[PDB]
Amino acid sequence: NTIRVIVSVDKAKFNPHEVLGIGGHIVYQFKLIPAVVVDVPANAVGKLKKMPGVEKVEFDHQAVLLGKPSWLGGGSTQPAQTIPWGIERVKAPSVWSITDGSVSVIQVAVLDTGVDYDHPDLAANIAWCVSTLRGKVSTKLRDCADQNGHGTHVIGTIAALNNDIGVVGVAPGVQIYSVRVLDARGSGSYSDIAIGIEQAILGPDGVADKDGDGIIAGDPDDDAAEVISMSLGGPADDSYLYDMIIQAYNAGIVIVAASGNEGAPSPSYPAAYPEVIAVGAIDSNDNIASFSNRQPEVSAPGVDILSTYPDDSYETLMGTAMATPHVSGVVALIQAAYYQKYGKIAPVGTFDDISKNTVRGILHITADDLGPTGWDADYGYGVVRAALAVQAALG
Ligand SMILES: [Ca+2]
Ligand SMILES: [Ca+2]
Ligand SMILES: [Ca+2]
Ligand SMILES: [Ca+2]
Ligand SMILES: [Ca+2]
Ligand SMILES: [Ca+2]
């Protein structure tokens, strides 16, 4: 009988009781942007628009996961640790002796279906679990656990442990925050995904900048993530969500997102935003996958990708969702190594960037440039390479 909407407001004029008085419900008041997620009856949407302090009324759109089980491969047919082909393709393993991600100030937030937080090849890296489903922020593990599989697979491509079992991530020492914004079927509301972005900025302690110095990502006094990774996509561009992507970007957080799997001519949202790295998928032959949405920023392995899967298991998945965490891994290695040497993180940088002084510039100039020379609509700048990116970072 009610509909979910996201109102952008003037905080000094807006009275939430007025929503309540028209038979509405306050779902979530954002700490970092001037907006509130509310449920209202249909009849009331008109009233909302007129109420004092309400500047925009946006409806709640849907995004979905961007990984599916592979047509080809299977599980980890081997009790030893396997290095999935993708981890090698992005030249991660040689980097680990310089850093594997385990620099204390670095956390990577993965906004997905949740995580199997007990998985033996993941657990020691899972630093915090949260769920924002239906706009209720929960840190009960039973609410944060993965009921799909996809988030556990994505998290394993970034950070599965480097040991003698399972698989291994691009950044196998990096601390992960699993932020569950998608349900058991892989579907999520934009309102929950924006709440998840907020949570990755706030971190475990619920405060963005606890010491007031204006540094959030790359402040060891705070517990903000440095990378937000979204292996998901929807078709709408909404102002409140972009407002949140901007808060994370201004916080110094690198945001990375799947381009989409529809062979479409451009990326889905939030990948399509300027402030987000859109990632396409290649296969084990260096061909762009036919399903990969075009004009990404970079590309990475996304076909026939073995990783962790719930109940202490392993599965082979495909999609731009699988490509995304390879790039999130590489970004974590860049920021870890950058901080380890300089005692701060590097700036995020722009889509455009070709300087060795920003994360995005480094990723671009060190990518393996495939297909047409330079940036192209299939590969973007090319396949990310961690070993070269770290060398560029420290140079
Ligand atoms: Ca392992
Ligand atoms: Ca915090
Ligand atoms: Ca701070
Ligand atoms: Ca500080
Ligand atoms: Ca941090
Ligand atoms: Ca090219």
Side-chain angles (χ1 to χ4, degrees), residues 8 15 48 64 75 83 94-95 108 121 149 176 178 200 227 232 239 242 264 277 283 318 334 341 350-351 370 383 390:
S8 291
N15 178 9
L48 258 186
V64 292
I83 311 196
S94 78
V95 170
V108 173
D121 215 22
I176 293 288
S178 173
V227 183
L232 54 88
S239 167
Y242 185 41
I277 296 167
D283 68 19
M318 58 182 179
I334 293 163
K341 170 158 206 282
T350 65
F351 161 74
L370 298 182
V383 177
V390 170

Side-chain angles (χ1 to χ4, degrees), residues 209 211 213 215 219-222:
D209 176 16
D211 59 338
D213 62 358
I215 305 179
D219 187 344
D221 304 309
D222 280 303

Side-chain angles (χ1 to χ4, degrees), residues 56-77:
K56 189 172 189 204
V57 174
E58 289 188 288
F59 297 98
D60 203 350
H61 300 301
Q62 289 266 285
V64 292
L65 81 185
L66 286 169
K68 296 291 179 167
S70 303
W71 286 315
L72 273 23
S76 87
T77 80

Side-chain angles (χ1 to χ4, degrees), residues 80-82 96 120-122 124 160-168 172 314:
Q81 181 169 274
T82 295
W96 299 330
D121 215 22
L122 300 180
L161 291 153
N162 177 27
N163 52 14
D164 62 359
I165 58 154
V167 296
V168 57
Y314 305 88

Side-chain angles (χ1 to χ4, degrees), residues 80-359:
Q81 181 169 274
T82 295
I83 311 196
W85 70 264
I87 304 304
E88 255 296 317
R89 174 68 185 90
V90 307
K91 311 297 177 221
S94 78
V95 170
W96 299 330
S97 51
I98 299 173
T99 187
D100 63 356
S102 55
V103 175
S104 292
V105 68
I106 310 293
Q107 290 88 27
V108 173
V110 178
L111 272 63
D112 211 293
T113 65
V115 65
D116 182 5
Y117 51 76
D118 269 359
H119 188 121
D121 215 22
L122 300 180
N125 292 336
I126 305 303
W128 183 54
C129 297
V130 66
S131 177
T132 67
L133 298 189
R134 286 293 282 172
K136 27 137 287 334
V137 175
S138 176
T139 47
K140 295 195 171 167
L141 292 173
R142 71 147 210 201
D143 289 336
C144 302
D146 191 356
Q147 294 306 149
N148 174 278
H150 182 266
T152 293
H153 196 273
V154 172
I155 288 166
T157 286
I158 301 179
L161 291 153
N162 177 27
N163 52 14
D164 62 359
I165 58 154
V167 296
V168 57
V170 169
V174 83
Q175 287 169 87
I176 293 288
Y177 293 168
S178 173
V179 187
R180 184 182 183 202
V181 308
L182 302 179
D183 69 12
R185 289 199 204 84
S187 105
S189 69
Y190 272 42
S191 68
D192 297 348
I193 288 160
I195 304 170
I197 291 165
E198 180 153 289
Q199 297 295 311
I201 303 172
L202 307 175
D205 72 6
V207 189
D209 176 16
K210 196 215 296 332
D211 59 338
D213 62 358
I215 305 179
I216 288 165
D219 187 344
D221 304 309
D222 280 303
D223 60 5
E226 281 60 34
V227 183
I228 286 169
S229 195
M230 285 179 285
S231 282
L232 54 88
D237 158 13
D238 296 316
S239 167
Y240 77 90
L241 177 57
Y242 185 41
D243 281 344
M244 191 61 56
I245 279 158
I246 299 294
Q247 297 296 116
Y249 175 84
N250 292 354
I253 301 175
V254 179
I255 308 166
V256 184
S259 81
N261 294 339
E262 295 77 47
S266 58
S268 296
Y269 289 94
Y273 286 133
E275 290 74 13
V276 178
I277 296 167
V279 180
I282 59 148
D283 68 19
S284 61
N285 290 307
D286 279 353
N287 295 145
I288 204 69
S290 57
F291 57 76
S292 187
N293 283 173
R294 308 329 214 217
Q295 313 186 82
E297 178 162 344
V298 291
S299 51
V303 177
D304 198 33
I305 309 300
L306 180 57
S307 191
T308 41
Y309 213 61
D311 277 307
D312 302 354
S313 184
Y314 305 88
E315 193 55 73
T316 299
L317 262 61
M318 58 182 179
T320 52
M322 283 60 259
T324 304
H326 283 87
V327 174
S328 302
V330 176
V331 165
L333 292 182
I334 293 163
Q335 303 283 236
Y338 199 89
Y339 191 91
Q340 180 165 250
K341 170 158 206 282
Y342 297 115
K344 88 295 186 74
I345 60 170
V348 178
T350 65
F351 161 74
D352 249 4
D353 224 325
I354 38 73
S355 94
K356 324 207 170 233
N357 312 288
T358 69
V359 175

